[PDB]
């Protein structure tokens, strides 16, 4: 009955992931697309399989406060967790052991992004208005830039030399780390056009486009190509929501650059078609503000995480 | 899971802390143990609790607290008069009332044009002054020591003396409801 | 000692008479005694012109051997050593709709 | 070959709607399918 074109191998087209005991603040799909890293407010990371049971086969603990942001490392076996307990942590996924815990920040480490081409290096931007760059094998932080306003969202560019940081200061900045080996570098690019804070930053699958979610209830698409018009602003999306919760609401690109998914505070999973700049999917089902949405590496699968201690995991039909 | 309440009997605050006392009382009509809800509508308010069952509430489309109708906020008489409908057939007895209930378990107010009569005879803004402390019975007798601190209204009762004896069952059914 | 880093690691030994012993490392004594598993003696015969130095060093197979340090002169490496489910569930559920 | 074509196709079966009462969604459809309201005179209530 109803036989509507099963896309994925998942048992069902809509799967809810439960087992957390707090808000789920950020999630991430394995590069090989058969793992889930879910970081909750309960300062814990659930590791789920994407197929055949959706088994949370490991719960990694070790943060003393909410694990606000999780990415995987480029090979998928090491995990980068960032928290409110001022401590970013590198873990081994298969094992259940923590590898390297760096806690150099003074306040909540809101945002992080690990570099996708090059060395094992990740940026982390926290409440101290400082965006710091962290190389894996040294135990000191390799870079430290100081804005004046608490850093909400940070990303490392496709190519690996600049860092994007956006926060409460109404303008997102692009900085050059090789241009800066000093302790008070000044910003390279000032993307303006959001009318208040930025909450989430995603680097496009080609690297020319940066996605910014703003509590300006606006998704904005900028181009980072060093040869741009005077206004790097390309696209605007309307539809999602930000409320008094001021949660860390993020961005994502479909693995093809064809869709863009935002987490919203109206409990809705929003998925726009980037081209027509209009709303493809408006999926309900979450009882709390939708914190981050992640598109599965291979298939059109979208998985969302909410402040309702669950994660919906399903495929898109049209 | 949620009271069936007059939206006046939730006060101005868009946020409501309400206490949920499951099996907290007997319905003032069906005499049934039910889940009571208690809350302070606003800062000038007292703590109001639901007075009747949830079913006995949604039968006659009345608030669980004020027992007034849900659409217009007028007693069940005034709405039944403008509705033109028959006298209540529902059994006054509790053996009868519980039998009617246990029947309706095992197996007209939403589809009416807005009656101009009821609309003409209703309050424009909410009677929040219904969500407020009773009158200090020690201030009446002149013997209140609590001063301005009293959580009870420091005024005298100014009420019709045939009123102030209202019956729950009669304000819910519609028989000799003096208001 | 750092030759604790070297137990199970295959090694070659020189004697004072310049005879060669190749085996794998098992246990070592303070007196530079050694325990060689799978040991064989490579004894250098004189090089008769017209043949490679590498192709006719007399190999005898000694088996398991133990080495007294007094005539132990030099040791090198020869080769390598020879050869929580968590409280999560996923259940299928439709997404609820407000209307 | 352009002889004559109509716009009758792409409607009918493909547009998959849910019952006007059901409070779940069993499949992820686009916004125009899953949403896109019921129909008809507001009703009296
Ligand atoms: Zn009420
Ligand atoms: Zn008093």
Coordinates of N, CA, C and O and ligand atoms in Angstrom, one line a residue, chain B residues 5-6 9 48 63 65-66 130, ligand 1:
Chain B
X5 N -10.5 25.6 29.6 CA -10.6 26.8 30.4 C -11.0 28.0 29.6 O -10.4 28.2 28.5
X6 N -11.9 28.8 30.0 CA -12.1 30.2 29.7 C -10.7 30.8 29.5 O -9.9 30.7 30.4
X9 N -9.9 33.0 32.4 CA -9.3 32.2 33.5 C -8.0 31.6 33.1 O -7.8 30.4 33.3
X48 N -6.7 29.9 41.2 CA -8.0 29.3 40.8 C -7.8 27.9 40.5 O -6.7 27.5 39.9
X63 N -16.2 26.4 30.8 CA -14.9 26.4 31.4 C -14.9 25.5 32.6 O -15.9 25.3 33.3
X65 N -13.3 26.1 35.2 CA -13.2 27.0 36.4 C -14.4 27.8 36.7 O -15.1 27.6 37.7
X66 N -14.8 28.7 35.8 CA -15.9 29.6 36.0 C -17.2 29.0 35.6 O -18.2 29.6 35.9
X130 N -12.4 38.9 37.8 CA -12.9 37.6 38.4 C -11.8 36.7 38.9 O -12.1 35.8 39.7
Ligands
LIG1 ZN1 -12.7 30.0 32.9

